Write a protein that binds this DNA or RNA. Structure first.
Ligand SMILES: [Mg+2]
Length: 810
RNA sequence: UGGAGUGUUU
């Protein structure tokens, strides 16, 4: 029910000086005051609500508030550093906004609470059990009140349109540069977390031009013909749900709920005439008579806004995309690459950008922050980290080599798989054009693939038993039926694909869920031109797909948790961007290495973070563990990815109980110790080497193994940061781990070391990964269920029995 | 789809 306290502080690893983007806050012990604001209408946007409260405090300067500068959260929560003359008596007041008839707003104020700040600092010293959230969020409201007025808020972030501060991405989208801000508690002090942030937005422009950027028109006049049944639906997918503003009447905002089939010249709506009889009138005709405006593009469709039942249709030429709309739809591959290139900063560069943000923010001169008597240190918090020692990786073959990770990396030169697979029969299914992928390309691809295979301990015996061409979606299952039907011991089928093709999704649906054949796809370009490293990495994926063991942790280097049988679980849920369902995935370890993992997946409610069917999922994973090892886990280690702090209790409640439920349903008195660990990549905590000498790579990031659990972590609970991976490009994201439950009384060191070692068991690469393999595999499983496409959906994701005990998701 | 890591009133 309640997260355990920090047991101790880790001492493993060599110290290292670090700086964090957490800026110390000096907070007075005063007693701040809380008021509620019932604003009528109660639906108004936060943005208007802030204007209301703005003029409301200006208008009633002498009556109510005098000279005090209160802070407003945008909804109905006002704070003051001094008591107001309200005196707990509800006071109904009036507010008038300079409108277009002007607007009138009814506002009422009342004292509701007496937030104590001294009650926070003691909680920061472990004095109290928990930390009061209402006081933390009260400070947050103070620190972001001014940013929320002068910038565009987006979650905890702030953006604007200064000097462009954006790069184009195509398709009507651009990436804006802003900054994140949050108030967070730590031991003995409150911290202000500041970071740069960049998110994708829809360019503000006329919809006509949006229709050009979407689709692909160098100029609208090139399409003087009603949009095809294809251009129309693509455009519908992009603009649906976006805000638009009128540019002809008297601006005015609307939400697009659909795009009409007909053009404006023929799209009609019922118009009631003076006499009371209703008649059908075209949008073009109505814009002629009413607004005296001949549509320039009457052959184009209309934007239906408002309720889908009502018939509010707007021509494209009178609408603009409203500025400041965060793009929440999936970005095209080319769009994300542009965003990645545009937003990647080295560690030293990002550190400076944060320092610049602090200078321009100048919190120590913000009137509202000064009003509440708060101070924000200008220097980054100093932290001592620890570089945990990596584990040794044991290989096999004849040289059974022991690799030693260096800066989060190692290779397989002069090393072979731990238990490699001997492969005799295997087919090639080249779905790419023979012209680009000629028989010479296949022969040399094969030739060099077998050379790399035998060098790694996975010898590919002889030539492929089969090698033919094909194309089309419907050509897979018939050919796959044949392949299994006519080849004894068919182990692996290599598939060649051009670029982004729908053959991949169905090649997996058939090989994973229907016939159950291990498949390995590979792009055409990686056939015409082959590299040893690419061939080597390719071999990692296919050895495990056939039950191999690429390597294992050096057994004697493991933490004592491996004394008794133990199962490691990873859990993740991937959500769509209304009818699409969420996909829950839970994987479990099936040996003591731990290397092999069995997967469970479920389709559940749209955007439900809670794993609904977790108990059933855990149950079958425990059975498979018993069937694979003939042991019953004495401990269950549960790595749960992607849960914000605001959902710890909800997930802890349902999912911790579900795990317990699966144990006792198997066996009344089976009570293994559970450890529940939330793993989070989606945060803005950033660590930088204080000494240049400790920087790693061209990015200058902290080294793999860097661990922090002292000054920026929870004042009482069991949490820590572990940057287990090597920063390649940009600035490393240190993974955060929060222990919500622990029956096994883990020490700080053993859990940190265990977590670190688990990041070295990821079989797809000879590198330490940013999260433990179980959590990573869980993400891959759910991703694979997406390519697999309520009763029918569950079976589209249900996996074939033969491929129910292998690592098909690799 | 070799891989990791980097940003997310009509
Ligand atoms: Mg997730």
């Amino acid at each position: 029910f309640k997260p355990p306290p920090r047991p101790d502080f880790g001492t493993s690893g060599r110290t290292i000086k670090l700086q964090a983007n957490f800026f110390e806050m000096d907070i007075p012990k005063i007693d701040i005051y809380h008021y509620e604001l019932d604003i009528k209408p109660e639906k108004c946007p936060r943005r208007v609500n802030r204007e209301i409260v703005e003029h409301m405090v200006q208008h009633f300067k002498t009556q109510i508030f005098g000279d005090r500068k209160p802070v407003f959260d945008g909804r109905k929560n006002l704070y003051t550093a001094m008591p107001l003359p309200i005196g707990r008596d509800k006071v109904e007041l009036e507010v008038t906004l300079p409108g277009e008839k002007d607007r009138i707003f009814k506002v009422s104020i009342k004292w509701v609470s007496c937030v104590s700040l001294q009650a926070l600092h003691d909680a920061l010293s472990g004095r109290l059990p928990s930390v009061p959230f209402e006081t933390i969020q009260a400070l947050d409201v103070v620190m972001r009140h001014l940013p929320s007025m002068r910038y565009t808020p987006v979650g905890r972030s702030f953006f604007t349109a200064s000097e462009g501060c954006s790069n184009p991405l195509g398709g009507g989208r651009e990436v804006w540069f802003g900054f994140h801000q949050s108030v967070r508690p730590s031991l003995w002090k409150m911290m202000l977390n500041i970071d740069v942030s960049a998110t994708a937005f829809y360019k503000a422009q006329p919809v006509i031009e949006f229709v050009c950027e979407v689709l692909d028109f160098k100029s609208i006049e090139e399409q003087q013909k009603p949009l095809t049944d294809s251009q129309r639906v693509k455009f519908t997918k992009e603009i649906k749900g976006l805000k638009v503003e009128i540019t002809h009447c008297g601006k005015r905002k609307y939400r697009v709920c659909n795009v009409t089939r007909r053009p404006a010249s023929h799209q009609t709506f019922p118009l009631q005439q003076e006499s009371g009889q209703t008649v059908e009138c075209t949008v073009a005709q109505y814009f002629k008579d009413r607004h005296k405006l001949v549509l320039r593009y009457p052959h184009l469709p209309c934007l239906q806004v408002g309720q889908e039942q009502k018939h509010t249709y707007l021509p494209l030429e009178v609408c603009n995309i409203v500025a400041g709309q965060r793009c929440i739809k999936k970005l095209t591959d080319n769009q994300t690459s542009t965003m990645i290139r545009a937003t990647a900063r080295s560690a030293p560069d990002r550190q400076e950008e944060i320092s610049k943000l602090m200078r321009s923010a100048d919190f120590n001169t913000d009137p509202y922050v000064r009003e509440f008597g708060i101070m924000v240190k200008d220097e980054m918090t100093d932290v001592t980290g620890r570089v945990l020692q990596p584990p040794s990786i044991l290989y096999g073959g004849r040289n059974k080599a022991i690799a030693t990770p260096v800066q989060g990396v190692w290779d397989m030169r002069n090393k072979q798989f731990h238990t490699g697979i001997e492969i005799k029969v295997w087919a090639i299914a080249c779905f790419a054009p023979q012209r680009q992928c000629t028989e010479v390309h296949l022969k040399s691809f094969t030739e060099q693939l077998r050379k790399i295979s035998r060098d790694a301990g996975m010898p590919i015996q002889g030539q492929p038993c089969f090698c033919k061409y094909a194309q089309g979606a419907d050509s897979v299952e018939p050919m796959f039926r044949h392949l299994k039907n006519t080849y004894a011991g068919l182990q692996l089928v290599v598939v060649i694909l051009p670029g982004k093709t729908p053959v991949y999704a169905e090649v997996k649906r058939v090989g994973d869920t229907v016939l159950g054949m291990a498949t390995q796809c590979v792009q055409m370009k990686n056939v015409q031109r082959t590299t040893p490293q690419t061939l080597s990495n390719l071999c990692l994926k296919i050895n495990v797909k056939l039950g191999g063991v690429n390597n294992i942790l050096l057994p004697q280097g493991r933490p004592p948790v491996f004394q008794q049988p133990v199962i490691f679980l990873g859990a993740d849920v991937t959500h769509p961007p209304g009818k699409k369902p969420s996909i829950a995935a839970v994987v479990g370890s099936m040996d003591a290495h731990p290397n092999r993992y069995c997967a469970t997946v479920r389709v559940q409610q749209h955007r439900q973070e809670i794993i609904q069917d977790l108990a059933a999922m855990v149950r079958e994973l425990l059975i498979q563990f018993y069937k694979s090892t003939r042991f019953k886990p004495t401990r269950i280690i549960f790595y749960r990815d992607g849960v914000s702090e605001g959902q710890f209790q909800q997930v802890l409640h349902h999912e911790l109980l579900a795990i317990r439920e699966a144990c006792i349903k198997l066996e009344k008195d089976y009570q293994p110790g559970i450890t529940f660990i939330v793993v989070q990549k989606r945060h803005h905590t950033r660590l930088f080497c204080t000494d240049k000498n400790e920087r790693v790579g061209k990015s200058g990031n902290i080294p793999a193994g860097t661990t922090v659990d002292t000054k920026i972590t929870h004042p009482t609970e069991f949490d820590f940061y572990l940057c287990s991976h090597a920063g390649i490009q940009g600035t490393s994201r240190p993974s955060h781990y929060h222990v919500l439950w622990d029956d096994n009384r883990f020490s700080s060191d053993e859990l940190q070391i265990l977590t670190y070692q688990l990041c070295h068991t990821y079989v797809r690469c000879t590198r330490s990964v940013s999260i433990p393999a179980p959590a990573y595999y869980a993400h891959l499983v759910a991703f694979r269920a997406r390519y697999h496409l309520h009763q029918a959906l569950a079976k589209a994701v249900q996996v074939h029995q033969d491929t129910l005990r292998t690592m098909y998701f690799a």
